[PDB]
Amino acid sequence: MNITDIREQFPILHQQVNGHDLVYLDSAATSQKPRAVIETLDKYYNQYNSNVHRGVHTLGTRATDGYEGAREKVRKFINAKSMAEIIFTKGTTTSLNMVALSYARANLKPGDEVVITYMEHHANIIPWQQAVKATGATLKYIPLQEDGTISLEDVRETVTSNTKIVAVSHVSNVLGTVNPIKEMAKIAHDNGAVIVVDGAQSTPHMKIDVQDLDCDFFALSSHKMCGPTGVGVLYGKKALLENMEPAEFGGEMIDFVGLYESTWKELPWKFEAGTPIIAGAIGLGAAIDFLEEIGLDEISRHEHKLAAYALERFRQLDGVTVYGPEERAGLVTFNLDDVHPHDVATVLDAEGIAVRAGHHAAQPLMKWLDVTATARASFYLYNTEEEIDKLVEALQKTKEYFTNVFVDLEHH
Amino acid sequence: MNITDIREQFPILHQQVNGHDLVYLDSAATSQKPRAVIETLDKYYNQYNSNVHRGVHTLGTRATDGYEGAREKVRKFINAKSMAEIIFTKGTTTSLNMVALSYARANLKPGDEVVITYMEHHANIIPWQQAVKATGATLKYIPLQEDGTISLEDVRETVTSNTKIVAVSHVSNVLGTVNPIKEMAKIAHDNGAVIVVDGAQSTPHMKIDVQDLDCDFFALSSHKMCGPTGVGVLYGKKALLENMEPAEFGGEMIDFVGLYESTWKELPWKFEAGTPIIAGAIGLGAAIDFLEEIGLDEISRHEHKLAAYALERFRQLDGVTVYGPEERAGLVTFNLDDVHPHDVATVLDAEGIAVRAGHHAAQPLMKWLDVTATARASFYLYNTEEEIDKLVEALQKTKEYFTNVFVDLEHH
Numbered sequence: 001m002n003i004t005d006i007r008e009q010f011p012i013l014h015q016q017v018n019g020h021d022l023v024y025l026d027s028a029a030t031s032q033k034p035r036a037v038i039e040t041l042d043k044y045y046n047q048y049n050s051n052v053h054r055g056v057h058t059l060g061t062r063a064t065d066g067y068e069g070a071r072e073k074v075r076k077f078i079n080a081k082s083m084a085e086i087i088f089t090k091g092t093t094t095s096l097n098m099v100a101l102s103y104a105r106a107n108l109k110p111g112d113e114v115v116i117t118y119m120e121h122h123a124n125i126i127p128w129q130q131a132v133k134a135t136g137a138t139l140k141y142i143p144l145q146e147d148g149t150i151s152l153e154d155v156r157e158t159v160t161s162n163t164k165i166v167a168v169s170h171v172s173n174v175l176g177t178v179n180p181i182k183e184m185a186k187i188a189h190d191n192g193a194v195i196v197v198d199g200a201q202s203t204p205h206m207k208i209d210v211q212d213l214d215c216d217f218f219a220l221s222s223h224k225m226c227g228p229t230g231v232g233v234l235y236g237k238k239a240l241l242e243n244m245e246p247a248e249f250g251g252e253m254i255d256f257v258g259l260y261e262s263t264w265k266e267l268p269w270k271f272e273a274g275t276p277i278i279a280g281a282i283g284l285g286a287a288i289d290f291l292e293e294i295g296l297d298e299i300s301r302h303e304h305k306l307a308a309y310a311l312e313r314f315r316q317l318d319g320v321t322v323y324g325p326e327e328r329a330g331l332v333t334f335n336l337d338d339v340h341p342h343d344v345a346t347v348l349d350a351e352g353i354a355v356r357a358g359h360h361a362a363q364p365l366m367k368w369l370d371v372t373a374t375a376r377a378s379f380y381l382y383n384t385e386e387e388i389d390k391l392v393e394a395l396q397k398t399k400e401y402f403t404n405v406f407v408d409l410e411h412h
Numbered sequence: 413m414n415i416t417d418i419r420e421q422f423p424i425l426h427q428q429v430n431g432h433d434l435v436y437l438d439s440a441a442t443s444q445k446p447r448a449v450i451e452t453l454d455k456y457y458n459q460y461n462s463n464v465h466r467g468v469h470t471l472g473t474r475a476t477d478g479y480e481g482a483r484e485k486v487r488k489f490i491n492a493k494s495m496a497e498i499i500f501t502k503g504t505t506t507s508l509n510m511v512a513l514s515y516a517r518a519n520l521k522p523g524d525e526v527v528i529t530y531m532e533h534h535a536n537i538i539p540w541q542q543a544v545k546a547t548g549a550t551l552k553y554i555p556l557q558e559d560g561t562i563s564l565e566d567v568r569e570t571v572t573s574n575t576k577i578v579a580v581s582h583v584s585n586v587l588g589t590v591n592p593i594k595e596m597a598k599i600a601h602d603n604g605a606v607i608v609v610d611g612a613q614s615t616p617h618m619k620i621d622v623q624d625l626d627c628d629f630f631a632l633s634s635h636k637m638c639g640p641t642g643v644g645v646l647y648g649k650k651a652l653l654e655n656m657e658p659a660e661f662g663g664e665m666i667d668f669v670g671l672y673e674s675t676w677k678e679l680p681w682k683f684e685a686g687t688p689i690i691a692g693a694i695g696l697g698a699a700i701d702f703l704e705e706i707g708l709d710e711i712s713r714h715e716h717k718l719a720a721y722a723l724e725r726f727r728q729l730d731g732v733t734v735y736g737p738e739e740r741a742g743l744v745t746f747n748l749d750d751v752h753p754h755d756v757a758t759v760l761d762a763e764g765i766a767v768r769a770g771h772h773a774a775q776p777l778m779k780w781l782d783v784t785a786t787a788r789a790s791f792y793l794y795n796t797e798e799e800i801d802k803l804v805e806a807l808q809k810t811k812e813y814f815t816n817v818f819v820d821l822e823h824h
Contacts, residue, residue: 011458011459012457012458012459012460012461012471015459017469017470017471018470022471024471026462026463026469026472029462029463029466029472030461030462030463030687032457032461033457033461037457038453038454038457038458041450041453041457042450042454045424045444045445045449045450045453045640046423046424046450047423047424047427048424049424049442049444049445049641050438050441050442050766051438051441051442054441054768054769054770056754056757056758056761056767056768056769056770057429057438057757057760057761057765057766057767057768058429058430058761058766059424059429059434059436059766060438060441060766090502090506090642090686090689091686091687092686093660093662093663093664093685093686093687094502094660094685094686096662097660097661097662097685100661121663122662122663122666122669122674123662123663123685123686125669125674126661126662126666126669126674126685127660127661127662129661129672129673129674130661139671139672141671221686221687223687223690228457228691229461229687229688229689229690229691229692230502230642230643230688230689230690230691230692231642248505248506248509248539249509249512249538249539249541249542250505250508250509250534250535250538250539250773251505251533251534251535251773252505252773254534254538256775257534257537257538257775257776258775258776259551259553259776260541260551261541262534262537262538262541273505273506273509273535273538274502274503274504274505274506274535274633275442275503275505275633275635275641276641276642277502277641277642278635278641278642279640279641279642280641280642280692342468345468345469346468348469349468349469349470353469354462354469354470354471354472355468355469356466356468356469357466357468358466358468361662361663361664363668363669363670364669364670364671
């Protein structure tokens with residue numbers, strides 16, 4: 001993996017902000033795109049845009065072959081058995097809501113449990129809150145260990161023979177924890193439950209094999225993995241999808257339409273109502289081709305290297321707290337002892353560096369961490385150790401600067 | 413309006429299919445895009461992509477200003493009072509489903525009616541079928557007149573003081589009928605109902621003024637109006653949206669998240685769960701700037717000219733039936749007396765011409781028309797009379813060809 005030649009493919013990295021070279025360390029909020037993806041959307045709209053799944057005219061055939069061709073690329077990318085298990089959606093959030101609406105709301109009764117964890121993103125909390133309220137079921141939380149991991153003993157304790165759904169992140173967007181999904185799926189199935197995996201922050205960064213994980217549902221977003229905004233996937237085991245009703249209704253997902261009653265198409269199109277996200281899905285197939293050509297294992301080793309370098313260099317700073325475990329994905333959430341993380345983020349942007357400050361869509365986790373907000377630097381396949389050095393040098397200067405501001409006002 | 417200079421802006425028109433200059437007459441299925449739109453998406457991904465609504469870092473601020481800036485462009489484009497009434501969705505189909513889920517399902521009881529028409533597209537049928545089934549309400553159909561228009565007397569007869577929702581197309585994608593929405597909204601409101609307008613085929617082609625129409629909800633799709641795929645709008649009167657609950661749940665549309673209960677953001681963001689369709693919405697704002705610079709009234713006059721020319725030249729062919737009224741939008745659905753419309757579409761594609769054959773997502777309408785399928789040529793701001801002449805000349809040759817095929821087999 002040559003990081004110079006990879007960075008050359010991402011036009012947006014080559015610019016200055018506030019007079020300094022951009023240092024983009026916010027890929028956990030969204031990733032940047034290589035030319036191969038942007039030029040895929042260009043070539044679609046410049047040469048073969050048309051509506052799909054009619055194939056009476058030549059451009060229509062080419063658009064349809066692009067769109068279903070991309071569905072096959074996703075199937076092979078996550079090792080699904082069939083394209084029937086691959087649904088294109090607008091993003092992870094919509095994919096999880098479809099499961100909560102079509103699966104959970106059809107299958108929960110009073111006394112049933114949905115089990116989640118305290119580290120979940122809101123996309124994998126609020127749909128379950130709503131589904132259990134709609135059905136009179138109960139929502140339970142798997143507790144965390146002190147370093148922000150999950151122990152399988154806690155899983156076994158929380159999940160019971162009344163659990164019907166366990167929903168959990170593959171990778172935490174805040175702690176960087178990689179959760180033991182494969183062993184949790186075994187525990188769910190032993191108790192009679194399905195497991196719903198929020199793979200938004202694992203898919204961009206490491207190989208996904210849904211046959212090895214044995215997850216019942218898996219959700220991911222294109223915009224975090226070098227692909228266009230506005231598109232995502234829901235994977236579900238074919239036997240579950242076949243029994244779920246659609247979450248949305250319209251043209252394209254019907255077979256017969258009478259005045260009062262309609263029948264649906266087969267999978268996957270039963271779950272794709274209306275003209276689909278044609279360009280975006282073709283662009284996501286290009287992003288997959290791009291990542292596969294570098295190699296997901298190479299990208300994960302690069303990210304492990306950056307994350308171990310970041311953790312070490314953060315330990316060199318005084319007065320900085322890092323949250324979560326030592327073994328982790330490519331991100332670091334942290335606070336400076338005496339500075340609000342929003343002020344940290346503002347000062348860093350003045351030195352060209354882009355990070356995030358806030359709750360990162362994990363309010364229950366911030367409460368668990370006993371903080372009201374954090375800052376987060378996150379890394380991807382275009383980032384380098386020199387960019388981490390710029391980060392830690394700017395945090396040091398931030399620390400000194402706010403110290404000096406304090407001291408002047410002290411004197412005053 | 414200069415059609416040569418407009419066509420110069422659409423790279424995809426300049427190519428051959430099967431050795432003939434492309435003649436794209438399928439813009440009612442999806443429209444083509446000018447350089448100003450495609451280059452808007454390019455410049456987004458090349459220069460300022462980042463996640464929106466944090467604004468701690470410079471690219472994040474620029475993306476957010478692009479995305480909310482586009483929301484304002486849509487507000488002014490349909491003459492909504494506020495950006496709170498403008499929700500970005502994945503397309504008209506999703507917008508109508510949100511109304512059916514958040515409005516109809518919350519407000520229908522046994523004895524309530526939802527009134528639609530026989531000419532509706534499936535996107536504006538199936539969500540209502542499902543909502544009335546979920547609530548035990550009743551679905552009723554406004555009948556059509558023999559030329560495929562709706563009379564207001566039939567509206568008045570069908571809508572009663574038990575009607576709670578009337579849902580109707582602004583423009584039919586099959587008959588080309590422009591429905592009297594403003595007078596139907598008055599009839600709905602007189603009976604205590606709201607009106608839901610499917611504006612997918614009117615918005616690209618004619619000025620929309622939701623204050624003049626007084627529609628309660630109005631839905632449209634970007635990909636039919638020169639903009640990117642995968643994005644649409646739902647407009648709703650602010651007082652209705654404020655009382656509806658969200659249709660999807662997640663990050664971005666919350667204010668507070670506890671373990672079991674959450675509170676929502678204000679409008680419009682209450683209805684936009686998850687990372688939004690950032691590039692596509694910015695591209696749709698570019699499409700609006702593009703259409704406004706030509707002038708929607710100029711585009712509608714061009715389309716009236718093409719439609720009157722097409723209807724006249726179709727009347728010159730023997731053995732061709734055109735469905736719908738004389739006063740119409742820029743499309744013609746038709747059949748050749750002795751040829752299946754799928755064979756018509758195939759032969760035309762061999763001469764470079766792209767049209768559609770099928771039910772056009774209006775099965776109840778095809779049953780009303782007593783046909784199993786039709787062909788449809790549809791026109792937009794890049795099409796010309798010479799392209800209509802090529803169409804009618806190819807239909808003539810199709811007619812002769814199938815006649816001769818018949819005659820050879822007769823002889824044989």
